[model samples]
Target: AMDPREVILCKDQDGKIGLRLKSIDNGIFVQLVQANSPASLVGLRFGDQVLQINGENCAGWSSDKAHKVLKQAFGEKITMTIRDRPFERTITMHKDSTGHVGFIFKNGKITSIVKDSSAARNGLLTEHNICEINGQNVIGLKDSQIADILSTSGTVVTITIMPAF
Candidate 1:
């Protein structure tokens, strides 16, 4: 279990928290906290699980419900309880001689896999956060660095990933 952190944010005149959220099977997770926003100023990170809002228990709340609650609290200072979740998994793929594994990346993260591509057959999924490549930690690495690693992998690539759900 992770320690929970409390965040208090006051919406802007436009009533926005500058937060983007996604719904997973468990609960709502912070997908993005816009830079310079109240959420970002408070240091909220991506993948933090929102446990409560405005002193109300929000466990198992769907993304829609969470949005509704936020709407109701517009223009007011709201308190949020959040916990960080850790997820790590490894996936191996063979690119064959053609150097094609059938996956597309965005921001160093796997965003899509071609249905018939080697990556798809090897069990890669979209939204898998790439943490390492070729035994090197790639967190926060530039896209060019990732491309260089893939190009030099020579038919075998080992990737450590964190599911983005």
Candidate 2:
């Protein structure tokens, strides 16, 4: 389930909230949040689609225009209404005796689902963006990171996936 959440972040002394934005589908999305920075401190994360800024509609805003607004907005008044990847979904399933979750993943994207295994039986599909494993964040993580997490997980596993369009 996805919901739009409003977050108010105070800028640093240098007037930076410390996050990057990317434009896709004529929409603004958070690309990254700097560690320990104002944006991260306020709960902003990668892949968040920004809906409104300071009570102003920003759905169709361009990357350039959004940049300018952040740079010029007054005070520590950066308020973002964001949807946490509306197209993403969560799956909780069991693992096979061979420690396999019945899927093959590349980098962080699922590429294959083994037949009759937990994944296939659980209705797991391929080409979905694998973003979390067992409550551990997997966005921007390496293949080894995902492998390690999956390999180390127990009989049951939970993963979050964002549909790859």
Candidate 3:
């Protein structure tokens, strides 16, 4: 299961990287649960204080506001100035979606499953595998495109997967 508290930042079409911070259960804590990403692979983790981003102090920004800033600045590297419990540090992360396709990458594979859709009912898919829709490789596509395709309103959609298992 994917924690709603874990946010995934990504780069937008204009080459800007953005941030998404979790806004539940502890007010202002940011955690990198996946160990294979730019954050966790680099040793970032849960309960870390995001003190600054790109040299701007996040003193007045709420988690929701920080999320807005991250999503709006997708595709670029923003300095993730974070603090580990009692230590403060900075890490430059190339902002990319952590929850894309309902999967988080870790250890060379996906780490969770996302339910509530046609894909979940099909019984042939899992998290972290690359998926294709209608013969088009579409795993890395944006949420808007995925919505546009799945909006066919109860159509039996075709999905293919390059399973990581």
Candidate 4:
């Protein structure tokens, strides 16, 4: 089964689309929902972090409050600020999606080396872009889940990139 509270959208400093999300707290962080999709066309993805909703920062904010803000922004442009991880710039996004951008959490800095088991090869996957799978958020996925998703047989994985600038 998949997690219910996974999926977010964001934008890069250059105003490019992105996502921010997690997977079952143990699944692989995924940016499956690419820009140009209904989600991205409006504005959303990995580069933007949910700092606040409806003028309220997430710090000490209740989950209900957050949900309410999303609900209010439904089908409309969601005004937000994003931290362009690559260029270290901030951007505003006006997304119109139900899910948040996708991403995964790591205890250490994002390394540039290509993983032997990774899906992508011979491309510049910047440190800013968080990896996600199939329109789902996965920043909070665990290593075991990540391995399982990556190791799945006959699965065509989609790698979403959240560029810095």
Single out the weakest 10-residue window by summed lDDT for candidate 1.
83-92
List model 1 lDDT by residue over 1-165, tens digit each. Answer: 568888898887777888777778767888767767888788776667788888887768878888888888856678998886445667888785668777999887898888777888888878777877878866556899898888988777888787764
Candidate 2: Cα lDDT at 113: 84
List candidate 4 segments past 4 Å from native.
1-46, 49-110, 115-122, 153-155, 163-165
Collision count for each candidate, in order: 0, 0, 18, 37
Off by over 4 Å in 3: 1-27, 87-165
lDDT of each: 0.79, 0.81, 0.45, 0.40
The candidate that wins on TM-score is 2
Q: Which pairs of residues have clashing backbones in candidate 1?
A: none
Candidate 1 global CA lDDT score: 0.79
What does the lDDT come to for candidate 4? 0.40
Query: Residue 2 of model 1: what lDDT?
Result: 63
Cα lDDT tens digits for candidate 3, 74-137: 4545556665432221211111233223333343233554564333333433443434454554
Q: In lDDT terms, which candidate is top?
A: 2
lDDT of 2 at 97: 72
